[PDB]
């Protein structure tokens, strides 16, 4: 199928309490597979999915040295950015980084990503051409000119077209059914009287992967959009996801209501009832 790999870095300054904390996580699609934390006792890249565990010592050692160097680089970036914005040297600030690749079923690169936020606001981003930058403001233009002089876009493009695509291909090969084959939801409807005249119907989707899902209540096969309570999709903690949708109905009218479930793992969309 189509697949993505993403790395997410967070650096948070803490002036007076030492160097910024740097955290990295890596994902294939909706599966976290690595972490690094600069505050760990002996910081190293650690596995977080079973199929990455087979990578040899050279992998872990290379990646650990990268994160240690990136933490120092982000520390310099946070110092430069509080200067660009004329900000107090006492305050805590956040630098976030997000990069990686989207590939099609043949493993070919569809899109590369390399972008940054400062204190939760977009700062600079590599354009879809993988050759030019979009800067948010005059501070980010300082970074843009520095990165143009250093030929940073060519370095990012080499990774995104090269190591990103090749390593994602590898992970999909080693992760087999865990990454390639969607896990459909386990579904059920519950019923909760509110009063003699009103009841809640709640449609559950549990244990599904990936996270993308649609749950809708219908009355006689028509969507009840404006009357459905829908919770945000949430992690079960075992790499699968949960969601529910609820509707309040007149007591004795439950039979008019059906829950429609759309998920990649389902052979076809499900229609569920209170039963």
């Amino acid at each position: 199928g189509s697949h993505s790999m993403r790395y997410f870095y967070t650096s948070v300054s803490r002036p007076g309490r030492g160097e910024p904390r740097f955290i990295s996580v890596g994902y294939v699609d909706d599966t976290q597979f690595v972490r690094f934390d600069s505050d760990a006792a002996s910081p190293r890249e650690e596995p977080r999915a079973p199929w990455i565990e087979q990578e040899g010592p050279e992998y872990w050692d290379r990646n650990t040295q990268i994160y240690k160097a990136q933490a120092q680089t982000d520390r310099e970036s946070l110092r430069n950015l509080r200067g660009y914005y004329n900000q107090s040297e006492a305050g805590s600030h956040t630098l976030q980084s997000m990069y990686g690749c989207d590939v099609g079923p043949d493993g070919r690169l569809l899109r590369g990503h390399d972008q940054y936020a400062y204190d939760g606001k977009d700062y600079i981003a590599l354009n879809e051409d993988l050759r030019s930058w979009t800067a948010a403001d005059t501070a980010a233009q300082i970074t843009q000119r520095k990165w143009e002089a250093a030929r940073e876009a060519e370095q990012r493009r080499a990774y995104l077209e090269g190591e990103c695509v090749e390593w994602l291909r590898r992970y999909l090969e080693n992760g087999k059914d865990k990454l390639e084959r969607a896990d459909p939801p386990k579904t059920h409807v519950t019923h909760h009287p509110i009063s003699d005249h009103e009841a809640t119907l709640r449609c559950w989707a549990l244990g599904f992967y990936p996270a993308e899902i649609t749950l809708t209540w219908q009355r006689d096969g028509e969507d009840q959009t404006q009357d459905t309570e829908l919770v945000e999709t949430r992690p079960a903690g075992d790499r699968t996801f949960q969601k529910w949708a609820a509707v309040v109905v007149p007591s004795g009218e439950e039979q008019r209501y059906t829950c429609h479930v759309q998920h990649e793992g389902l052979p076809k969309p499900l229609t569920l009832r209170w039963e």
């Binding site: 790395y7 890596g26 990268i66 680089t73 700062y123 520095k146 990012r156 990774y159």
Partner: peptide
């Protein structure tokens, strides 16, 4: 695998 370290901003 992650990308080699960037130039500072």
């Amino acid at each position: 695998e992650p990308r080699s370290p960037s130039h500072s901003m």
